[PDB]
Amino acid sequence: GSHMGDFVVVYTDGCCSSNGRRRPRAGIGVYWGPGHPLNVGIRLPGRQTNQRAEIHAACKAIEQAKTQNINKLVLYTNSMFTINGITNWVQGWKKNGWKTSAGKEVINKEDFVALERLTQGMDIQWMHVPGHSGFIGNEEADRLAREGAKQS
Amino acid sequence: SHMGDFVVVYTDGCCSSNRRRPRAGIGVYWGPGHPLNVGIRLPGRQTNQRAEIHAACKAIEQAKTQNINKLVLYTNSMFTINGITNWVQGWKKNGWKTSAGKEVINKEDFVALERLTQGMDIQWMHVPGHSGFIGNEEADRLAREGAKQS
RNA sequence: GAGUGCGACACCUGAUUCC
DNA sequence: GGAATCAGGTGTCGCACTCT
């Protein structure tokens, strides 16, 4: 178990073997600490892609948190897409019929709508962790997602 | 060792620990009791790619020392072979960017190797997994020997 | 509306060598 | 298993132009 001031630190990550190929396998992973009862690594239900696993691994961590009555959180993910989406983009997407900058429709709307819904009632600091650069937290969350993508 | 007027040479690098004291070696073999057969220490940052590349570099300097311009080069470093026979064309065109849009790490090394190849007619031969070729084994022996000497 | 670049962070597939 | 390294891909977005 780890913390920064009053915020408990959590790591999330998604993965997907054969992303954009013929047989995609996507998984989610959240790491709270060594041997933490809350660490999970499971198979991502639905459309298999890296983007959804990254968004959905972040959703899982928040659900778990509410489950522990946690309201302050530092969420580390190596997914700028997830971050930018939830902390910038969704705001504008809501005032424009969910439309890309190329007049078309935002592909992960349901993933971001599900995410934003979870963020109600949560002071969360979305911090980017560079992937594959020695951050135990992020390697483990990646380890956990790979294991989860090896499932159901 | 000659394939016609083309003379044959074997090159190889090595680097164990590739974490603590990455030690890198360079070896170039021309044949039984040849005055230019050498095993020496890789200068600079120690990696396997750098030793394989500078092993080729070393051999080409030696060829020139012998007024050789048609050279057949044997190495098991497909990375070296690919950078020099076909990737450098694109890197000099795209500002030395990788397919992932990042910077070519061994840029310095390939530029030096490319410089040495001006005026050289060189055939790059990949020596596979494992074959006989005492040439490759010798070159290997040379590299591991040069692996220790600052 | 159609399209083309560019940037960024991920997610991969593959290959050879060095351990 | 890992490192050193590269080539080809998709997943997705914003940003910046141009319509033969």
Nearest nt (C1') from A132 Cα:
C10
Provide the residue range defining the domain that includes A124. 1-152
What are the structure tokens assigned to A116, written together? 């934003």
What are the structure tokens assigned to B33, written together? 């009791």
Are A146 and A58 within 8 A, CB to CB?
no
Q: What DSSP string describes B70-127?
A: EEEEEES-HHHHHIIIIIHHHHTTTTSB-TTS-B-TTHHHHHHHHHHTTT-EEEEEE-
Rounded Cα distance between B61 and B56, Å, is 9
Experimental technique, in short, is: X-ray
Breaks in chain B at C–N > 2.5 Å: after which residues? 18
Are B24 and B51 within 8 A, CB to CB?
yes
Beta-sheet pairing, B70-75 with A7-17: unpaired
Residue B48 Cβ under 7 A from any strand D atom: yes
What CA–CA distances, in Å, run from B22 to A32, A56, B150? Answer: 34, 41, 11
The set of residues, in sequence order, having a beta carbon less than 8 Å from that of A93 and lying 6+ positions away, is A99, A106, A109, A112
Rounded Cα distance between B67 and B36, Å, is 13
Nearest nt (C1') from B48 Cα:
C18
C7 C1' closest Cα residue: B101
Q: How many domains does chain B have?
A: 1
Are B23 and B46 within 8 A, CB to CB?
yes
What are the structure tokens assigned to A1, written together? 């178990």
Residue A18 Cβ under 7 A from any strand D atom: no
Q: What DSSP string describes A41-100?
A: EEEPPSS--HHHHHHHHHHHHHHHHHHTT--EEEEEES-HHHHHIIIIIHHHHHTTTSB-
Q: What does chain B come to in residues?
A: 150
Q: From the CA of A45, how many Å to the C1' of D20?
A: 45
Q: Tell whether the torsion through CA atoms of B52, B53, B58 and B61 is positive or negative.
A: positive
Listed resolution, Å: 2.4
Q: What DSSP designation does B132 have?
A: -
Nearest nt (C1') from A50 Cα:
C11
- CATH at residue B81: 3.30.420.10
